[PDB]
């Protein structure tokens, strides 16, 4: 589907912003204590890629809402001084601009 | 000395408020990622005991400032919903009331 090519391109330009892959995979409680008690709706780019390939998103709107979820999760759990918080903030705003 | 008697009692009373010994020993960056860069003046009950034994406090004001420093540092480093933050803020205010 044409929406799938569009979203794959956007997903690719977004992931390039995350060269360490902090957003690549699900966060586990093992590597972020209490993370699942605090974030009740997890998201990551690998799940968004599975979502595009499953034709789960019917619009850029729905895809942007998962990207937002993912950055809002990292800004909620991580302290502001961290690499994770600062990346999430940065990419939230830059990626919304890039998708418009 | 007699100040030592006084401070040893206040210490044992404060330390009973911490049955898991969250504050018994210095925090290390391995149990608390990023701790030594954020907290510039670490404190814990063990360090406070040794300062009593070593006669470093000259007044109860100086002891209460290291107690507050220990609770301040926990408030700062730990997210507010954490057992660590909770117990630091709770014991800071109760220990100051107890020792006045």
């Amino acid at each position: 589907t044409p929406i799938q090519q569009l979203l794959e391109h956007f997903l690719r330009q977004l992931q390039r912003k995350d060269p360490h892959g902090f957003f690549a995979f699900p966060v586990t409680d093992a590597i972020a204590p209490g993370y699942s008690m605090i974030i009740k709706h997890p998201m990551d780019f690998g799940t968004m890629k599975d979502k595009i390939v499953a034709n789960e998103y019917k619009s850029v709107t729905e895809f942007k809402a998962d990207f937002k979820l993912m950055c809002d999760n990292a800004m909620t759990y991580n302290r502001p001084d961290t690499v994770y918080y600062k990346l999430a903030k940065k990419i939230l705003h830059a990626g919304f601009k890039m998708m418009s | 000395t007699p100040i030592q008697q006084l401070l040893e009692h206040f210490l044992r009373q404060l330390q009973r408020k911490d049955p898991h010994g969250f504050f018994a020993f210095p925090v290390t960056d391995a149990i608390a990622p990023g701790y030594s860069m954020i907290i510039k003046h670490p404190m814990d009950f063990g360090t406070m005991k040794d300062k009593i034994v070593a006669n470093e406090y000259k007044s109860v004001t100086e002891f209460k400032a290291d107690f507050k420093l220990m609770c301040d540092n926990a408030m700062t480093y730990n997210r507010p919903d954490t057992v660590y933050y909770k117990l630091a803020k709770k014991i800071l205010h109760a220990g100051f009331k107890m020792m006045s």
């Binding site: 966060v27 590597i31 972020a32 204590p33 209490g34 993370y35 759990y77 991580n78 302290r79 961290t82 690499v83 994770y84 | 925090v27 149990i31 608390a32 990622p33 480093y77 730990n78 997210r79 954490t82 660590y84």
Partner: peptide
């Protein structure tokens, strides 16, 4: 690298 204590 990630989180606080726990």
């Amino acid at each position: 690298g990630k989180g606080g204590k726990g």
